[PDB]
């Protein structure tokens, strides 16, 4: 029955649970964390506890904080450090993420992902768009030939961009981290008056390392069409396969 956790192990397990609730990881390693919490923190670690910690870190933030995501009330050596760093290294051991605390721009960017639109059925659009040309409204593409690097700026986070045989690093205004799992890119979600997801993320790819030679992004592109009266909710949806391979000409 011995499930004693060391401080680093317990912290990694807490971070794994945080990542799981952020929907960045599908798994967690947390066995023995209830007693670890009740012993090294003094409070219960139920779901509500985690929700409130993530809330008060990313929203309703209060000045200084510690590595366990605890703040010092409002006004101003274990957890009693409360050293507001520029970042927090949420590392569970299985997946790392550099999460940023609240400011004046992260509070402006918090949207409430609580519903979802109906997009458009499927406009007769092409599936073999390249990188240079896009013309999408949800997608912006930057190519730094000086670094052999590609930034894929997305403007519509609800529209997914599944990766395949790819190794990317997405930088958000809430948390920067790298993704290698093929499929939908996973973004953090705080439940605070609803589920809150970041307003935009950026997908950087290093074309140097041949790691993303076979990298294919299947995504959805948005372009206005014809209007029966006004372009009132003019149609704008068609699937597309974007290739990153270093194919000349």
């Amino acid at each position, epitope marked *: *029955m*011995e499930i*004693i956790l*060391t*401080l680093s192990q317990g912290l990694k397990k807490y971070y794994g649970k945080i990542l799981k609730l952020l929907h960045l990881t599908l798994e967690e390693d947390t066995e023995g964390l209830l*007693e670890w919490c009740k*012993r090294n923190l*003094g*409070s219960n670690c139920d779901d509500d506890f985690f929700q409130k910690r993530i809330e008060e870190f990313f929203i309703t933030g209060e000045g200084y904080f510690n590595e366990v995501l605890q703040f010092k009330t409002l006004s101003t*050596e*274990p957890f*009693k450090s409360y050293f507001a760093k520029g970042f927090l290294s949420i590392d569970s051991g299985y997946f790392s993420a550099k999460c940023y605390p609240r400011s004046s721009t992260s509070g402006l960017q918090l949207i409430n992902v609580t519903q979802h639109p109906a997009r458009i059925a499927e406009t007769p659009g092409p599936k073999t768009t390249s990188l240079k040309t896009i013309n999408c409204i949800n997608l912006r593409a930057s190519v730094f030939k000086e670094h052999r690097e590609v930034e894929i700026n997305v403007l519509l986070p609800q529209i997914a961009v599944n990766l395949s045989n790819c190794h990317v690093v997405i930088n958000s205004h809430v948390c920067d981290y790298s993704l290698d799992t093929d499929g939908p890119v996973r973004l953090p979600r705080i439940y605070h008056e609803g589920t809150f997801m970041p307003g935009t993320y950026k997908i950087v790819i290093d074309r140097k390392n041949k790691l993303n030679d076979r990298c294919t992004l299947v995504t959805n592109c948005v372009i206005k069409g014809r209007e029966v009266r006004k372009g009132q909710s003019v149609l704008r949806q068609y699937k597309t396969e974007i290739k990153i391979g270093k194919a000349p000409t």
Partner: antibody
Amino acid sequence: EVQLVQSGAEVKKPGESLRISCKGSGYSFTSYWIGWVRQMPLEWMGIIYPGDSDTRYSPSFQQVTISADKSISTAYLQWTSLKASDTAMYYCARQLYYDSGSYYTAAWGQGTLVTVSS
Amino acid sequence: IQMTQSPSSVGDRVTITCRASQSINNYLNWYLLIYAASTLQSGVPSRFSGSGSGTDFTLTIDFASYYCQQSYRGTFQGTKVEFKR
């Protein structure tokens, strides 16, 4: 140097409320954890942080209440209803990487005798 | 959750051992006398020495009462060491 002075011995009746204290000097009363330990005529009772704090009562041992006022650097241990089983000596102790080398250090007061009798 | 429930003269330099119900690394602070299961506190004579591991520890040597403590939940048994004639 560092000194811990406890409140005097208390003789109360069963059902009477009681509050004993422990005042610290020679140190900030904000960084080194401070706890209470029972010895019936040693049983660990509780601990709290000396500054802004919650409380770490021993499992199952928690009906008493441990608190503290950092404005006067004084910790408190109180009973709402004393029982004859609470007649014992109660020691307050200041104590300084994981569990070892940490707050359960026992880095002590003179002891407070509490006698519950009608 | 159980804890340390299994433990253990005419001027005879002796030794007191101790066990536990689970592994507890190397704390068992003995009383202040010895912490870190071996380290001596500033102001304690060097004749007191500590050793052992989580399953069982030893303290090798003023005849009085003594015993140890865990640094996790539960903490502290009592042995009385004075007897002659």
